[PDB]
Amino acid sequence: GLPRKILCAIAKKKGKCKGALKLVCKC
């Protein structure tokens, strides 16, 4: 599967760092 770090990396790159991913990716 995809680790939260990888999810955050993808979200960070794609600009999909929202919600919890916003907190983690710090967008």
Automatic annotation (TrEMBL):
Which cysteines bridge via disulfide bonds?
Answer: C8-C25, C17-C27
**What is this protein identified as?**
Lasiocepsin
Organism of provenance = Lasioglossum laticeps
